[model samples]
Target chain A: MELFQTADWKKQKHVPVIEVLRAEGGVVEVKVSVGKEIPHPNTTEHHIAWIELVFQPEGSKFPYVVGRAEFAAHGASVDGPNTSGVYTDPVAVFAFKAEKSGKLTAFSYCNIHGLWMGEATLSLE
Target chain B: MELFQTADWKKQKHVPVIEVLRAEGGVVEVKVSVGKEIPHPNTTEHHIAWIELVFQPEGSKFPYVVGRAEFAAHGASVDGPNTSGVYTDPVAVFAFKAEKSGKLTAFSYCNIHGLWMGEATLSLE
Candidate 1:
């Protein structure tokens, strides 16, 4: 997937609000952020990807870091100069939840520096 | 991180290997595979990151794609003109298991073109 971007504030400033879906009809919270540098260059505007899916895990300890995906982007999430939007494709494999009956939301950051956000949240339930 | 590899089969013929973890005592199958344009400079050797973690999800259906770690390498998981090893960083967030008390072995592929594997497997308990 080609990351899309545009400095147009109306579309860029606020970061792409991603919405995640699971089997239990839950709304998960997903936030996106980039390098604290905030200058050099802007990745694909909303370098943070927007995802919508239905996932359910057994517990609550989720690991969102993947090896092949990160290297593919060179650790440059929302700030690499090579491609307006460098680091991208950070996915939430599956968030562990207490209730297997519900669902887990997923998301990640995008920038030349990878996710400044050491964490991801789900705004859906 | 930068992808790594070598043309030497004794060292680079095979791609890097990755592993995932889930708290389900379940052995989920994780595989990797990427584009077939296999002729290029090799990324870092053993680019695939090895992992060790205790994760637990909510249900059984899992989603393993994030959006912040791929663009970092310029879409080069294990292959790229710029980087011999382009693609690296593919993880399994959490493999849903029927039982969340055990574990889920997770992993992806590291290649000049991403994982030739479409899935990941857990050889350990």
Candidate 2:
């Protein structure tokens, strides 16, 4: 079955936002987060389940798995849904080194909305 | 080809280290790192390339991808190997929520040594 949903993170809250925090000295730091522009729900019933990052160096046979973050606590508890005060934010940071420039892609899963995708370009000087 | 090598992290330096940072209020915080006791190389020629975390909740048919961290920079750059001096550490932290207890598995890749696997049990009270 088709599993992923795609949209510009600028317009859609479900799409992941990929930002290059730093790129120098052969290392690149990237941050991935959801609901940067538009807020997404963090309730127990409707929340972001996970976010994954991948990198595709130019001319590589396959993309490399950079990092992933899972947000399992959405104010959930034995007491009741949304009863717990603690919640997890759908955000993560990953850093890696690469010899070539490439594209950085991110995927996020919403428990109710399924999967969403977003992308950013990594250019080396 | 055989892609993965298995060993106790306590006996080997290549194995990934999995630690439950916290577990309470329906949430679990976990940290995965390499070379906790023994030192692993971080040079451009020999280094930990990446680490990944997975969770298999009790009674779940498939395991969930918890998180992944890739150490791309091993001090290599246009100047020369180890010239840039910036290195990515083989460490990462992930947090999630679950109602049942399960196993947390970790995998790490070394540029010169191939892949390694490690595991930890997450029990809920």
Candidate 3:
């Protein structure tokens, strides 16, 4: 199977939803979420394990890690799986300073579905 | 004015909403957000500028910085204020491992509203 999965976030639930919330004064705010249109199951058996955000500045050789959030809780407890009431939602918003225009990419991992990819353009102009 | 503001997140929009999403096998997942119940303005005039998360392990004299996120964009550009359509939501989710039960604290700063505080307890038992 392909290591990285890609799809339209509007159509697929596993694809990461990347939005350039705000960009001005050399600083940018980005939001990444999974299952925006369709809700992904947050059960112990099937859930989004984590989401990572990366930024590749224009003409850069490599992408820099903006941030990474891991969702380890899927309603699991000492009793059994899905027995706990606590569960983390698959959503994150963060901000960072950027000197140039670049591409924002997000990778999300699902416990059962593997890895998914999404991207957005960041324009300083 | 008080340096740090505090209130019930259910009643106030500035207070951070801290949720212990999951804790098992020494790993804990935390979700912190501003304006969970009430929406905070995301404008250049008045908006949340940043959020900081800290953790104080049991019996520790000081807290460790878990993470920090800065929101520097509020729709301001060379054209004018609020001219840009980008705006960031005040929310975040992250995971960390703890050897002992302790406290998780979140601080959020608004450009016009000063600082706000919220906290939650983590129990291994």
Candidate 4:
């Protein structure tokens, strides 16, 4: 019997990073805009969210949505739950597989209800 | 004599890195889009042109536009002179000063008219 070797390629998973701060009057707005950083800068549309870590792209290609997420462009616009409420805590986790190395990376971000929110980076081994 | 010590910050210029490839035909089309990469990923509008190298931001504060430049974001949409003309040679040089510890970076891109185009990185050391 002859068997061929098959390798497994998968995405990187990491601990979600979280940060919280107080916005003006303990009530701040937010916007989440997630994307991959390309050396080209022109292909931004191709990039999507990947947890929290804004990926440092190696090639020009974009990643699949299976390991994707989204965020804000302005610190004032975010996907808040319900009308005008303090964002106590918010986060997102992702799973991804690079086309070549097949390594996975995890990203996350958070905010406190009625306070400031920030991004975080959590890498998995 | 009363003496006062003052500090001055300057910008960095890098050697231009250019690549020329035949645009499948005798002519090629080009598009250059330039912007700064905010670690935040959302605050992009504040970022503008700065020659060939894309400045890896150190602080959350944006830089003041002094000696800056611009280029294409998509390889196809670029500032090519004339209508329906094939671009043979294109180059952009820029100067900049960082607001903080103030290390200036550069960025650039190119394309041939009616064909394919790409971005370039040229730093001034």
Q: List model 3 lDDT by residue over A1-125, tens digit each.
A: 88889987778899999998888876677778899999888887998877788777787665666666666546555568865444556777666566678888899999889999999999888
List ranges where model 1 is wrong by over 4 Å: A1-14, A18-107, A113-125, B1-12, B17-108, B111-125
Model 3 clashing residue pairs (backbone): A21-B86, A21-B87
lDDT of each: 0.32, 0.76, 0.75, 0.25
In terms of lDDT, the poorest run of 10 residues in model 1 chain A is A63-72
Candidate 4 local Cα displacement, residue A65, angstroms: 7.9
Ranking by TM-score: 2, 3, 1, 4
Docking class of 3: incorrect
DockQ for all models, in order? 0.05, 0.13, 0.07, 0.01
Model number with the top lDDT: 2
What DockQ does candidate 2 have relative to the true complex? 0.13
Candidate 4 lDDT over A1-125, as tens digits, reads 10111111112112233322212332322223221121211121221122323222233243222222443322223544243332222234433333332212233322110101123222221
Model 4, B15-81: lDDT tens per residue?
2332322122323212222221211111122211123333322442332222224322322224432
Candidate 1 lDDT for residue B91: 35
Instruction: Identify the superior model by TM-score, candidate 2 or candidate 3.
Output: 2
Query: Could you tell me the lDDT of residue A37 within candidate 1?
Result: 25
Model 2: CA > 4 A from native:
B1-39, B42-88, B93-125
lDDT score, candidate 2: 0.76
Backbone clash count, each prediction separately:
122, 3, 2, 61
Candidate 1 structure quality by residue, lDDT tens digits, A11-36 = 34323232334435342333233222
